[PDB]
């Protein structure tokens, strides 16, 4: 528990902001 | 990416993986310009089938439990995230090459540090937001991204 905050920014680490697909996603829209 | 102070059997394993994620890269590279040649030229004719020919080969290496630690030390999810990122027209990879690297996926020992130099955790995303993936490869997906955003 001790660093359990740090979790969070490990998530970030591993995926990032989430948009590097976007134009993808647009383009089956 | 072989270590100079192991024996010939590892050195032998790890240029195996390391070929492996050559051709890898390769076969995706050469779909990617087919499928780019196809846009270009309205040629309809042209489909990429080069990961679909190596799967067979990419799906034995993944499925020995034997060769999990030469897998992950050498980083050959980084080919895996390429073969799963979708194509320059926005399309994704044949089912059977999404379906069979998320099952290998699934009994692999994937780490926090291997999802960082791989980048698969974002690709692994993007497959549960596309409305293009079947809703059993959905659930494969969650269910990786869940084991891997563990607290």
């Known amino acids: ?29 | 990416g072989i270590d100079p102070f192991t024996d010939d059997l590892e050195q032998y394993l790890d240029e195996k993986i390391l070929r492996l994620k050559d051709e890898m890269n390769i076969a995706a590279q050469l779909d990617i310009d087919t499928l780019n040649k196809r846009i270009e030229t309205g040629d309809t004719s042209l489909i990429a089938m080069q990961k679909v020919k190596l799967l067979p080969k990419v799906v034995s290496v993944l499925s020995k439990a034997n060769l999990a630690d030469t897998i992950l030390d050498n980083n050959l999810l980084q080919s895996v995230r390429i073969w799963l990122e979708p194509l320059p027209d926005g399309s994704l990879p044949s089912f059977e090459i999404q379906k069979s690297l998320f099952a290998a996926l699934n009994d692999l020992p994937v780490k926090t540090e291997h999802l960082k130099e791989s980048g698969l955790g974002r690709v692994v995303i993007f497959y549960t937001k596309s409305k293009r993936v079947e809703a059993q490869l959905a659930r494969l997906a969650e269910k990786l991204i869940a084991e891997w955003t563990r607290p």
């Open chain 1, 1 to 29: 528990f001790t660093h359990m905050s740090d979790k969070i920014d490990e998530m970030y680490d591993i995926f990032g902001d989430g948009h590097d697909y976007d134009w993808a996603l647009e383009i089956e829209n």
